[PDB]
């Protein structure tokens, strides 16, 4: 909520206040820190096949 | 009219702009201008009545 009457000021002021929400930032953080471990599986299913 | 939602903002922002209006200013001017002429006029009548 903003304290004005000019149409559209709420949209641009909310856009400036929040360039990205915290929850989607945390979702991207959860995604980006899990995929380093998957290559470990790419070792295991490799070497067992060689075994 | 003013570009805000705060109640009472119009009442003070109008009052700062116009501490007096022009049409009430010119009446106060034109009375003070013509006070001495009617003073002289009513004085001369009494002096003529005395003589």
- Cβ atoms B9, B2 nearer than 8 A: yes
Token pair, residue A44, equals 């295991």
Q: List the resolution, Å.
A: 3.6
This structure was determined by cryo-EM
Mutation target to probe the A interface, by most A beta carbons within 10 A, among B4, B8, B10 is B4
SS3 A32: helix
| B3: nearest Cα among A4, A13, A29 | A4
On chain A, the residues whose CB falls within 8 A of the CB of B6 are 3
Task: Indicate yes or no: CB of A6 within 8 angstroms of CB of B4.
Answer: no
- Cβ atoms A4, B5 nearer than 8 A: yes
- Alpha-carbon span B8 to A50, nearest angstrom: 82
- Cβ atoms B13, B2 nearer than 8 A: yes
């Amino acid at each position: 909520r903003c304290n004005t009457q000019q149409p559209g000021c709420e949209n641009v002021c909310y856009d400036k206040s929040f360039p990205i929400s915290h929850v989607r930032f945390w979702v991207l953080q959860i995604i980006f820190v899990s995929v380093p471990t998957l290559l470990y599986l790419a070792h295991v299913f490799y070497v067992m096949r060689k075994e």
